[PDB]
Amino acid sequence: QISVRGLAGVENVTELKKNFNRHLHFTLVKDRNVATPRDYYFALAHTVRDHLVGRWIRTQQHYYEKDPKRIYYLSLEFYMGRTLQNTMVNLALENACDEATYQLGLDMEELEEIEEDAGLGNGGLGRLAACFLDSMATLGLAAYGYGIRYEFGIFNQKICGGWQMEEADDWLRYGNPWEKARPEFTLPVHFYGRVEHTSQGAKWVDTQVVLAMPYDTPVPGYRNNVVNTMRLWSAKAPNDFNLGYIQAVLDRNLAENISRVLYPNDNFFEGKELRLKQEYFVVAATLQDIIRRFKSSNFDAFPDKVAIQLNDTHPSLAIPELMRVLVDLERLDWDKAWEVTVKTCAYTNHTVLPEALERWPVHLLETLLPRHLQIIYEINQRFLNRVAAAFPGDVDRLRRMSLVEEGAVKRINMAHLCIAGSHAVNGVARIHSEILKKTIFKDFYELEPHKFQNKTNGITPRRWLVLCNPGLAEIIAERIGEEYISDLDQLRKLLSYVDDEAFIRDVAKVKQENKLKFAAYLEREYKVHINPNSLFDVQVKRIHEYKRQLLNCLHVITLYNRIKKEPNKFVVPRTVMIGGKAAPGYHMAKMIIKLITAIGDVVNHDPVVGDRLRVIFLENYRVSLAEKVIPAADLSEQISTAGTEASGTGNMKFMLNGALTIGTMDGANVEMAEEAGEENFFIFGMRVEDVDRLDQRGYNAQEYYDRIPELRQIIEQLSSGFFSPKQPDLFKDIVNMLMHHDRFKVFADYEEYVKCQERVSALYKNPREWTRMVIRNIATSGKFSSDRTIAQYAREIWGVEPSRQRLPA
Amino acid sequence: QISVRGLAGVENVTELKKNFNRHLHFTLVKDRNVATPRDYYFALAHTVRDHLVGRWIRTQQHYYEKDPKRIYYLSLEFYMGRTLQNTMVNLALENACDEATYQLGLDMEELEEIEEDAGLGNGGLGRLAACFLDSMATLGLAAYGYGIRYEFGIFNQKICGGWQMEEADDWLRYGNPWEKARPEFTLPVHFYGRVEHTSQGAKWVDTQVVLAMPYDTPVPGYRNNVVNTMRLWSAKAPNDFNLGYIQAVLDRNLAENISRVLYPNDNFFEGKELRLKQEYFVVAATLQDIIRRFKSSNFDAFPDKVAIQLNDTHPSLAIPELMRVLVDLERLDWDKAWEVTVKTCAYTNHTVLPEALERWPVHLLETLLPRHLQIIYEINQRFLNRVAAAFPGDVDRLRRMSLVEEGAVKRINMAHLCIAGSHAVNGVARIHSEILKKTIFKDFYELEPHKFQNKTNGITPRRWLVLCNPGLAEIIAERIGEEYISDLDQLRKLLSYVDDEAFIRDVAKVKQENKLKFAAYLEREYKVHINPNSLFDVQVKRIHEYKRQLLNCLHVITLYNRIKKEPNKFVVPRTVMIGGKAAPGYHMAKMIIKLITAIGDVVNHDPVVGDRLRVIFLENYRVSLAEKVIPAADLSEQISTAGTEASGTGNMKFMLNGALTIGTMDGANVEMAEEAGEENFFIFGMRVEDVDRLDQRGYNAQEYYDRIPELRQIIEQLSSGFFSPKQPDLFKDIVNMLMHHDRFKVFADYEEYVKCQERVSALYKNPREWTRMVIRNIATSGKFSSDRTIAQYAREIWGVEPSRQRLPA
Ligand SMILES: Cc1ccc(-c2cc(=O)c3c(O)cc(O)cc3o2)cc1
Ligand SMILES: Cc1ccc(-c2cc(=O)c3c(O)cc(O)cc3o2)cc1
């Protein structure tokens, strides 16, 4: 129907239908009479997968022929979402498949909805990995995603009585048609044991073996016929394992638990053994695989053929592991092995928040990875010797920079390990990268300034525009062509259309259609009635104190109280939608969810309010829900305390999809405002500098409570039980935190937020000027493409040249 | 090459090759350069599976159209072995696939060897299920095998220092291409809880739910285009299960352990909770499925549409479960529900050995299945009331016949439950069925003589002749045609060829070729040197006291001692091969294995012996090894104490494949000797009557030790450490048992065994007369086809007529 979805040729369509009917019969062992919609999804999935195979084989063949430098993206998270539509998009099969299925009397949209999300990630960090894979394939890089095939991904979130409940994400129940098991590439991973010092170096012995079995998933580039690989490792017990008999067999589960479940913490460190096992498991299996590929091309050339990107410190053990292989197994001298390691590895930092910092107790590493600890101590000694030589007598520096933290229990700072063992350390937005150099890694910067880079995050415009927002994609394509999808900078051409009446009409029309479709989706799946003519005010992201959903809650209650004070005065109608998962053990995050729903219970049922104000908690926020709600959004809420949100990526998704941003000068917000112009952005609140000023003198929340009557009223309402009639003291922990222990200074930004929100409403009253500002945002969103990001990684870190040239089909 | 393997048409071969190359590419994502032999096996497996699909869909469709009476074979064991060759055989694709693969430069035989056995069984009972499925498909019955998809089947057996070691049978590691998951047919199974008595009857509440997910495997009939279903249930935890968070996810394993591992006990009851869970799980999921199919055709008609065969007492809970559904859920009156149950269910008994009898502690059923216990007590009360009325004043009868056994702990006799709740009780050989009526079920017979039947066991001639012994199949086909494969009685026509020089030559030639091939197989896979001109003396079956491998050991040591006494005297050369698995906790069985190997260590390394005597323990005896060694055998050892082996089926396999039988008048041996003639059988030892005579007066083993010098020498050798120089007392437990606690009277049969073995050797010296006797055996083996067995089940128990008519392709 629409052009950017590709051609529906008579040949293609005939062929797709034939193969659909083939798979239904032979693959699914079903006829048309007994088939469920799930069968139909599977038939289509297999049919589309068939188009990947040739390209997948050719691409891997090609990388063998040409032997390019290989990029290894190590992450414990790949937040992939659904694969079907994305595959169709990148292969240009969407319209053909739409037509083929239509003729079979099926709605492709309905079939797409049957696919489970591969939710093998928590949030930003995980989704960045996913976007990166897409971009790396699109830019023709010989790149491999390496991670863990979790049996269970991020929990499914149910709301029960306004509270979050967690359900196991059994995503593999019905099978995964996208993966291919490679049992022939199974590799041993070792744990426990002890170190033995012989004549011929150190030997790790008496270990427990877990096997790592790889599953390969294709990563198609955008219309270039490149298909890269995501390899995820599954834990399998050896056959001699525990080998009364029955219990031995049952106890194989112990070993296989390693790949069982994704830890559901966002920007939080939990020092659990099972977590460390996951970290070693992925690192050990990957490095063996890397080295095997390399040897089928001495170690001098390793860094010319291998780049390893560490996604946060989660795979930091790659550094000691690479040393261990090089020193203990390959018998290189320390210094040479170290050179190779440093020149191979690069570290991306994702946050400065201290509770996220991985600091592993020594006693844990001692038991689990005895050899790796020795190697870490050796790295620490040699590193600290360089520091001593550069800064003679600066004993405090030595203490601050040590990989080993002294204290109650000794810990390893994995971030320090990463900086020491990497040739490049990058942040994920300009302000974040600057903060790293100014604050938490100041000492490291002073020693090795050359290591520290910026690589501002991005999002794939494939998933995050073409896929989720085809109507916007099309109207843009009608003006400026299709080239922009793989070259997002071309969106600037839209600036010359800012005074075009037809384009203004189109932008606004697409937004209205998206809103209608989302409001419909709500009624179908979660029976709730929302006004589509209202401003869609959405905050979707993990629930955190630092992300300040609470600040949003305060505004929501403010609007409510203002309506009640003056019922018969006009206000711009809003639907306020907040969505996100709390980590299961994060009490405050779980309380915030409850507050959100508790406000809804009051606001949504007040006759005086009408449909002027609605508060909706979006249940089970995940990738596939982001694809629905983001296109439908008017106002993007990016309201973290300045200095807390390293980058964000949600911010970029909304900008690309025609929502305006209300936000702080935090993370990539700063660069978005820079690109679009401050006049086209609803910037409010303290800057980083302001927060520092407040910290130096001390943050007294009472002062704000005393001086802002509107704020006082809200706190009195929370305390007295206005929002919890049956349990008047329900929200005492919220009030107490805001008043006495608020690290994120919610009250400090309250006044500027509310005022700035008034300005949003004022602009919304003028549809034409709203839409013109929207155009200025979309048209300057080009920088925030992961294509740009990966291009910068490739040139400035990995030392490879990206390519837009197509492989032969 | 050979005719019974079907046509290799130019069209067929071209088509198979095209589809092989298709699957390699699309299914396995491999090209010819990277493919392993395992890939090639998989490509062929998928290609052959493609030929099943059409027939599978049509057959199930047909059963919906015609709505025939449905047979449900409930077993906890299906010893299927490999599927590929069997599928090819039954579809007539063998030669075409041989040709197709040959042209692709591959050896099909090598690819076949890559397939894992589906070892979801222990021995006789399990293999009988498998043969039955084949026969039921071949005889056009609307039949379904129902069982458990164990993640791990019967352990793989390694010999280490002459001792059995067990390894996990991880048969699903590389995937199973034969199964199809049916998640849409997932069903809840309940455990624990408590009973609540309301106004409207009893209610089972507060239960723990496990889900049962079915996997369907095709069962092709022989060349009739019928494909029946084996449905095996897998345990899956519900998503709300245990739903800190991490542990909850990990604890899903608890629930899934139900389908994890097959209990590796042969004819032995182990009263473990996990075992009872397996028994309820398969019964609960199956009965729901049966009832669902039935309702898509009141309960009056259930037995006209449903037969349920219980394979031993393992699925005895089907009786209380059917009552529970009918009474508690469907709200039928007790008496009517009972009528339906009895008319639906039939019980096959597999042994009289008391340690095999399932006697479940009440406290276990009380906790796990509270409602089923109440129903059992109710059955018991009503049953005992009928007994009281028939035998007034016979209080002892009441005690003997009770479903509930009084004692230290109360137990339920599941065999009593089965007799009470079934319209038919059958043994598995004439002598066994008679023993049931005379001894262990005398009381039950006296009450309901009409219930007790015989159904002598059989083996499928497809697997056990055509598949494993194509050369024998062919030479038979050259004379009498191919019809015999589905009508084994036609083998009688071979009696008219007993004096044909050409046929005698052919029978002997095939035997020699089989021996050469097996002797080769030994060298390749287990580097050992055997004389192919020797008599192949084989005993393969589970290791048991009752099966008397020990008696065989005594003979072996006797031959050895005789050679040593007179080195320069001629003896017929023998290779003695004993194979079988011991249950992991069966100490005596594990000692016997050790003795066997210990004899080998002495005999096989004695220079004086030469190649006149070799003792080989066949490692990892399983279905696929039976297919190799049985065709190669000359003498079949069936030497159980009379009254112990209910039937046996190994006996029949050897008879079909041109080995002579040395054996006791036990089990089906009696009928084999009857069919072939006693003069064509090496019958020795006590009859049942003789054993009874010995028991009445008492078995004193000392008497035999005192009177038989040859026997005394052997016992002195065992005791003094002739066979265990380093550990002189290794075999004290063997000696002590034989002397003082031998339930199986090894010494009593010793003299007649050795003498009868002398007669075997004498006949072997005359090849022509040996072969003529072989022909008389093969030619009278027709009765022992499972086709005959199933035909008798169908007519005399199930009330359905078998059919040899083909379905349209
Ligand atoms: C700034 C900031 C960041 C993260 C957190 C956080 C995140 C968690 O997931 C979390 C948890 O699972 C258990 C717990 O006891 C505390 C926790 O705290 C708090 C504050
Ligand atoms: C006649 C007869 C039959 C079966 C057995 C038998 C079989 C077993 O599997 C077994 C076992 O696993 C553990 C054990 O302690 C004893 C056992 O005894 C013994 C004698």
Curated annotation (Swiss-Prot), chains A, B:
The modification Phosphoserine is found at S3, S402, S486, S719, S720. Its cofactor is pyridoxal 5'-phosphate. Gene3D superfamilies: Glycogen Phosphorylase B. It comes from the Eukaryota. Keywords: Acetylation, Allosteric enzyme, Carbohydrate metabolism, Glycogen metabolism, Glycosyltransferase, Nucleotide-binding, Phosphoprotein, Pyridoxal phosphate, Transferase. The record marks C97, C131 as: Involved in the association of subunits. One of its GO terms (molecular function) is nucleotide binding. It catalyses: [(1->4)-alpha-D-glucosyl](n) + phosphate = [(1->4)-alpha-D-glucosyl](n-1) + alpha-D-glucose 1-phosphate. Allosteric enzyme that catalyzes the rate-limiting step in glycogen catabolism, the phosphorolytic cleavage of glycogen to produce glucose-1-phosphate, and plays a central role in maintaining cellular and organismal glucose homeostasis. Homodimer. Homotetramer; to form the enzymatically active phosphorylase A. This is Glycogen phosphorylase, muscle form. It comes from Oryctolagus cuniculus (Rabbit). The lineage of its organism: Eukaryota, Metazoa, Chordata, Craniata, Vertebrata.
